[PDB]
Every structure is written in structure tokens, then in C-alpha cells.
């Protein structure tokens, strides 16, 4: 919801 946590893999 804000941007950071993801970045897959």
C-alpha cells in the first residue's frame, strides 16, 4: 500500500 515491502522474488 505504500511502496517498500515488495520488490518480488
Amino acid at each position, epitope marked *: *500500500d*505504500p*511502496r*517498500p*515491502s*515488495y*520488490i*518480488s*522474488h
Partner: antibody
Amino acid sequence: QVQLQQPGAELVKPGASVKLSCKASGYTFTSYWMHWVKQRPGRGLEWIGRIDPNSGGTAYNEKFKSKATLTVDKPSSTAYMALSSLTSADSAVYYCARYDYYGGSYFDYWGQGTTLTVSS
Amino acid sequence: QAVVTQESALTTSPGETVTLTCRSSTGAVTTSNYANWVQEKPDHLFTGLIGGTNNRAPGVPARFSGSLIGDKAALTITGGQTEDEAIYFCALWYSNHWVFGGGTKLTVLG
């Protein structure tokens, strides 16, 4: 009911390598990420890293990159983690915790943790 | 890197509200840290309750909720139950790794 079964105690000598397992069940194994946490009395909980059952992609903690190697066996729905060049500090309990998606989200299920004891 | 701190221990009674906080040494806890709270009931029984500052885990009792209180992340428990006495851990995300706090030893005088 979602369950993550991990061995309870493992005994191994300093210098060897172990491959801790983590059996999943009760959900589609490849829809959620798996993380590994290390806990030692004193300190608290330290994140090791994760793997994505679908992609195989993984993100490690800079401090554990040359120490652990995560992987998964889709068939048997199990996540593994080999720790290399074992020492005294590597002794402790190691958990595998399932990760949830969408807008970041959470860490809902956990395994009971395997207590690794490294001594000779 | 970014040591995270929570309260040593806290004591509450059944029926009241107790709040737990989480400190981020890099400054403030923000919606971008995706605060995560995890409970530790005796004999290594771990359960996630809250993830991403305020998303409640599925199957998690309604009385649990997460939020931001100032420049901190907090777990509020309204109507504390006896079984709620356990250890609570705070998880903070920092660009590419997870940092927990030391955990808070919660006591519900049941």
C-alpha cells in the same frame, strides 16, 4: 487449519552442515513466501531471509548470505534451509514462518522452530 | 543497523486495554516499514497477529489492532483476555531486511 511442521532438536558438530526442513500443508504451498528467523537467548529474533515457492527467487539478510541457503521442494510442500560451516553462535532455534501478500501485509503461521545445538 | 525497541514488560488486567509500542532508531516508524506484530505463547508457539502496521491476521481475535501512535508503531489490545499473557514481538521492514524488537513481556492478571 494451516500447519508448518519442523523437527524439534538437531545435534551436529562444529564444521559440518545441516539441512533443516519445514513441511507446509493446508493451503496452496506456492501462494505464500517462506521466511526463516533465528532466535538465541539474549538478542531476540533475527531475520535470515526468504524464498518464493513459485519463482524460487530469494532475498537474504546481508549477514546470512554466505551462511544459509533456502530452497523448496514443491511436490512434498516443504521448505529447507542448509547452514554452512557451523559454529557455536549458530546454536539456537530456527523457525520457518509463512508470509502473506497484498499491500505488503503479514506473517500469519509459524513452525514450532527447530533447536539446533552445535557442539563437540 | 536499525535497532528496534519495545517495552521490557507491561502489566494489565482482564477487560482493560493495553498498548504496546515499537521504536525505530533510524527515526520514525512509517507506513513504509510495514510494522508486523507476532505473539509468542510458551514453548515456542508463534502466531502473527498484525502485519503492515494494521492488517489483522485471518483467524485473529477482533480485539487485536495495529496502528501508528506518533513516530512509533503500536499494538492495541482492547479487552485483554487471560490467554493474552505472552510475549509480543515487533517487526520492522527496512528496504530489504526484517528487524525485530526485543519483544514485550505482557501480563494479563487472570
